[PDB]
Amino acid sequence: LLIIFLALGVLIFATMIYYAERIGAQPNDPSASEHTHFKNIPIGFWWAVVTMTTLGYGDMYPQTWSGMLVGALCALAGVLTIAMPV
Amino acid sequence: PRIWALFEDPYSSRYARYVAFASLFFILVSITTFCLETHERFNPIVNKTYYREAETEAFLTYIEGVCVVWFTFE
């Protein structure tokens, strides 16, 4: 149950943060994402694990208001979905 | 009943469990194709003649077509 909850949360929040961080993307740069650590989704998996476990290394964090909302939701949902079966 | 047995519980039959495993495989393939489509390694920059952008690899589009064919059949 715990591994299923973690996998679902990680996938959903990784996709959400990757799409949120691209709203504030600068149009000038040719690449889709240049100023954000969330250049793709697997990086989102790593960040989602680190953020749901309330670890918070700080190597990668959202830098956009939408990203900040997604990050707050990720932290809260991680606390809940970890405190369910433990 | 035999038609609807494809949407019933997997353990309720053998065809049901087999279609369940197949749909699981195809959903996982779709999710993986999405996650790899969002990557840089599969989005190399190209020159189009006058717009400059990055294009997705053809393999991902073909796999997506296969998965969408399966899902539309189901």
From Swiss-Prot, chain B:
N-glycosylated; contains sialylated glycans. It is found in: Cell membrane; Cell projection, Axon; Presynaptic cell membrane. Glycans are attached at N47. The chain crosses the membrane at residues 18-36, 63-74. Homotetramer. Homomultimer. Heteromultimer with KCNG3, KCNG4 and KCNV2. Heteromultimer with KCNC2. Heterotetramer with KCNC3. Interacts with the ancillary subunits KCNE1 and KCNE2; the interaction modulates channel activity. Belongs to the potassium channel family. C (Shaw) (TC 1.A.1.2) subfamily. Kv3.1/KCNC1 sub-subfamily. The segment S4 is probably the voltage-sensor and is characterized by a series of positively charged amino acids at every third position. It is linked to Epilepsy, progressive myoclonic 7: A form of progressive myoclonic epilepsy, a clinically and genetically heterogeneous group of disorders defined by the combination of action and reflex myoclonus, other types of epileptic seizures, and progressive neurodegeneration and neurocognitive impairment. EPM7 is an autosomal dominant form characterized by myoclonic epilepsy apparent in the first or second decades of life. Cognitive function may decline in some patients. This is Voltage-gated potassium channel KCNC1. It comes from Homo sapiens (Human).
